[PDB]
From Swiss-Prot:
Localization per record: Secreted; Fimbrium
Gene, per the UniProt record: papGII
Species per Swiss-Prot/TrEMBL record: Escherichia coli
A GO MF term: carbohydrate binding
Keyword Chloroplast in record: no
Function, in words: Tip adhesin component of type P pili that plays a critical role in kidney infection through targeted interaction with the globoseries glycolipids containing the Gal-alpha(1-4)-Gal disaccharide present on uroepithelial cells. In turn, transcriptionally regulates host gene expression in kidney cells, leading to inflammatory pathway activation and renal tissue damage. Acts thereby as key determinant of invasive uropathogenic E.coli (UPEC), which cause pyelonephritis and urinary-source bacteremia.
Lineage: Bacteria, Pseudomonadati, Pseudomonadota, Gammaproteobacteria, Enterobacterales
Disulfide bonds: 44-118
Miscellaneous section: Strains of E.coli that cause infection of the human urinary tract produce pap-pili (P pili) which are hair-like appendages consisting of about 1000 helically arranged subunits of the protein PapA. These pili mediate binding to digalactoside-containing glycolipids present on the epithelial cells which line the urinary tract.
Residues of the full protein shown: 21 to 216 of 336
Tagged with keyword Disulfide bond: yes
Protein name: Fimbrial adhesin PapGII
Family affiliation: Belongs to the adhesin PapG family.
Major subcellular site: secreted
Length: 196
């Protein structure tokens, strides 16, 4: 059998870019911060709870789905590009709307730990794993009005936890499903457009 649950993180953060000119591509840092995660998706055909007497195998993969473009409050498109993805695996590059970053750090791990192996949407749990930062750079449209900006960039981040009854178990949430996942994170990009 196979139980997969996606634990969605949803913290709000701000990044100050300062004074910028439309000929620049100001960057902003996206950090992965430990916190409370909410189940927003699952697929299970196995047991609901492990009482401690039995073994199962773990496969954990971190996910980040980031938009390639975001509308400013006043109605202007900002183009988001990956500047430094660190060790993250950038996949489904063909998509025209979102970036897909993954990082599998655990697989084939046998465990007897008692617990719920298929929590339902809405359930929570604490995540303490840390992952590399991802730095992006933004292209501002030349016609962007001067002034201060505080752009809300919503995105998805979380832990795909896969529990299975056999060694060698492998699973990846489909990209088309992932892109639809709730984007509970929010990066508030701050900057003052002084022309250019």
């Amino acid at each position: 059998w196979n139980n997969i649950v996606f634990y969605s993180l949803g913290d709000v953060n701000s990044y100050q870019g300062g004074n910028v000119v439309i000929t620049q591509r100001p960057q902003f840092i996206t950090s992965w911060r430990p916190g409370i995660a909410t189940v927003t998706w699952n697929q299970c055909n196995g047991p609901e709870f492990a009482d401690g007497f039995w073994a199962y195998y773990r496969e954990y993969i971190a996910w980040v789905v980031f938009p390639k473009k975001v509308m400013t409050q006043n109605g202007y498109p900002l183009f988001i590009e990956v500047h430094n993805k660190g060790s993250w695996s950038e996949e489904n590059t063909g998509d025209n709307d979102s970036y897909f970053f993954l990082k599998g750090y655990k697989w084939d791990e046998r465990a007897f730990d008692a617990g719920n192996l298929c929590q339902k949407p809405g359930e929570i749990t604490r995540l303490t794993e840390k992952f590399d930062d991802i730095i992006f750079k933004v292209a501002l449209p030349a016609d962007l009005p001067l002034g201060d900006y505080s752009v809300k960039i919503p995105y998805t981040s979380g832990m795909q936890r896969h529990f299975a009854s056999y060694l060698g178990a492998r699973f990846k949430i489909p990209y088309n499903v992932a892109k639809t996942l709730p984007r509970e994170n929010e990066m508030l990009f701050l900057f003052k457009n002084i022309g250019g």
